[PDB]
Ligand binder design. Structure first.
Ligand SMILES: [Cl-]
Ligand SMILES: [Cl-]
Ligand SMILES: [Cl-]
Ligand code: NA
Length: 57
């Protein structure tokens, strides 16, 4: 399952909604997954056990 939120460019974190609560996780440091655009959509995928702060559109 995918849980969405928004990323912080300054802190390279993703704040996502799951189980009624907001959770802050670091984004990856990888070039094409880190938070490059402030408040970009991000998601935690609990199937793949991944975070991506450059989700596609
Ligand atoms: Cl690194
Ligand atoms: Cl990457
Ligand atoms: Cl990850
Ligand atoms: Na980084």
């Amino acid at each position: 399952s995918k849980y969405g939120g928004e990323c912080s460019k300054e802190h390279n974190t993703c704040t996502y909604r799951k189980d009624g609560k907001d959770h802050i996780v670091k984004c990856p440091s990888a070039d094409n997954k880190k938070c490059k655009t402030d408040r970009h959509h991000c998601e935690y995928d609990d199937h793949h056990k991944t975070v991506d702060c450059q989700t596609p559109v």
